[PDB]
Ligand binder design. Sequence first.
Ligand SMILES: Nc1ncnc2[nH]cnc12
Ligand SMILES: Nc1ncnc2[nH]cnc12
Ligand SMILES: Nc1ncnc2[nH]cnc12
Lengths: 273, 273, 273
Amino acid sequence: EITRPPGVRAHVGVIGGSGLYDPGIVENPVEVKVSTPYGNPSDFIVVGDVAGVKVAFLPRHGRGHRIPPHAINYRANIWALKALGVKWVISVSAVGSLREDYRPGDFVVPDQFIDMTKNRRHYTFYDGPVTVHVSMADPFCEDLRQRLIDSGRRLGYTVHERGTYVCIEGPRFSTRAESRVWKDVFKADIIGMTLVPEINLACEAQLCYATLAMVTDYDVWADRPVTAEEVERVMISNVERARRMLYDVIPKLAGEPELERCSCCRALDTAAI
Amino acid sequence: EITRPPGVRAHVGVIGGSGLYDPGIVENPVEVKVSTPYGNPSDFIVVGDVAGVKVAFLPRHGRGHRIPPHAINYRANIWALKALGVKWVISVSAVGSLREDYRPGDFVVPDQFIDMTKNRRHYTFYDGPVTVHVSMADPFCEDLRQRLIDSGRRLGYTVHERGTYVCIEGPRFSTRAESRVWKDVFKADIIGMTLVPEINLACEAQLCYATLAMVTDYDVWADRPVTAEEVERVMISNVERARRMLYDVIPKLAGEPELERCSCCRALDTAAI
Amino acid sequence: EITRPPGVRAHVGVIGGSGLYDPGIVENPVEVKVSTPYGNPSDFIVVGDVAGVKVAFLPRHGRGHRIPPHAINYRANIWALKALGVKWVISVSAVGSLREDYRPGDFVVPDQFIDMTKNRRHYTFYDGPVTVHVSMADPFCEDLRQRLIDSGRRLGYTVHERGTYVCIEGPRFSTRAESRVWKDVFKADIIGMTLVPEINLACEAQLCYATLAMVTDYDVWADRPVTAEEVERVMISNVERARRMLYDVIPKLAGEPELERCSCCRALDTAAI
Ligand SMILES: Nc1ncnc2[nH]cnc12
Ligand SMILES: Nc1ncnc2[nH]cnc12
Ligand SMILES: Nc1ncnc2[nH]cnc12
């Protein structure tokens, strides 16, 4: 509603690490405060120009990785992006792999998820009196998934074109017994902590949201189990490739998502009672 | 404790949609406010006579479907019914089907459930200093299940006599990956959002509770995934059949549940420490 | 930080029932209040000497079993033990069995767990600005597990040397449909309510924690389902054997845990961002 500075708008939102913003590319960056009914987003939003497209960058963990997955104000974050006018949301996330062929350093563009979170407090924007039940059979925006996959291929990177993400509560990593359940029983492909309720909220806000996941580790299945320092190290080693993909895709998002390939773009038409 | 008007009592409680109350049948309806230690129930309770049996009707979502499943004051709702003296609780619920033979428009009287909720805040009435752990191996009241099945058969409706209900958090519907887990891995039959913690609380209150579920949709498994508007439409089309069953069963509930076919009727004898 | 009386320290913590403290063994017991940033622990901590080793005893449910599993202040409890200087934590817990060969009266020293809790509110000590993700692939302290198994064998008791614990929310016990999932789908061995988030927090605090579980019942799988009164009765019948094991093991804990057999002893080195 109120922004400071006033009158700022953007077309594409990027949620992820602070390292994705590059001041050498983004023209006329401005730090923006956006009012939300839920209080503070994770940090200031940075708005600037990439090849003529206005982009809003939000670090989900805050600058300096100050906010763990369970403590993020997911409602404020998605509200703020929607208030700025964005239509496309690219989420960039680190994930663990549950399969030998999805290797550290590969990208995955997932198509499904399983929510095993417990403690996120709000899974919706709609607490009444209008009851809203969005259909999430196909929860990601296909228009954007396909654009991410094409970019990655054109740049020569490995991009797995499907994947089921199991979202766990954390902040601790899985036990071996849990990981066996995710991999052998649920048949999930990748594991992370931040997708839910971010994706739920993006869908309710009628955004075209997709995830670009970067595999950082093999969970408990290698010689050494995952540690936080390994995730950060691998991520920082490869953020350059994620940046190159982002600066390739964003100019192609000057237009609107195609309704027939955006499951959430008109979610509220059929969802509200 | 305090009611307004004072001195109101009832024998049978019905929890479900507002459309189930029929002013053409119910004699001498009175809207009742019932004090609870947990604040407001979903709405006023309507108490009236059906063929000489006193019935209390509570719309779980409130009149006008104002309260989504995660925001319902389950403790207040079950406390209020217990305070009015009810022994039998018929819950009427819309569910999705995970099996081709449980079709839209069929009734199901489930016998088991799996709780996959996350965000309901209170799963019990007993937070100490008396610790209570009720046994819920057979969580529904068999005496009432059998009466519902008999009514449905006598009226010529399809009533499936068993079923495992998976209760999910919502308000969003399942992904395809989640639905595959419910159906293929957990082997659940029907899916809904409101059973838990309603059933837990009913058991702790020593009520004979059973669910009459109406199948409204096939979840993600048809040509088109479930939407909220489809659920409401199918429900409203068939509420007439649910009403006919209710007005058939209620006169037969003039007596008491049989202890040997009411697993929760003496739950607290063995549950309290 | 502040203790009353001041200057109290201990080396070994025991978490479990009040019946484990034996005033005939423990020399110079003192009831201690320990300040925590999270408010009150379950009860006073009792500190005393067992064969020259200083031991702190905390009843997790409080004296008189006043606090059910979902209402325990897990953060306060583990903070208080850490503030007293303890290095070893022996948790004693009642569990249900999901397998015929783990019989009522047997001990189990589990090696894995699966968290199916929902409502414990805090799963970590670290809410930012330092984000901490501890690795819990092998979540129990092996040094202590092996010492418990050896004690039990030397005293002639049955001690199962492995086991996956599924931790459920409660306070109600499982349905038959849920229990089938735990046993047949997840392949868990034992079931209980109190392990999580106690173990998470112990790991973050760099404690060597292990569970000595006592099987009290077969969940829903016997002729009669588990009840609370059966759990208490079986527990109290066998607490004498648990006491004998504790007074055998504690003198052997005069030293420090071996780092190579203590997965959490240096958890924070690699976990903090
Ligand atoms: N193995 C893993 N589990 C959960 N979240 C992760 N993020 C990165 N790697 C992960
Ligand atoms: N498919 C479905 N999933 C969950 N709750 C429902 N209620 C009605 N249909 C449902
Ligand atoms: N069957 C059971 N389920 C859960 N917690 C328990 N504690 C003891 N027996 C149990």
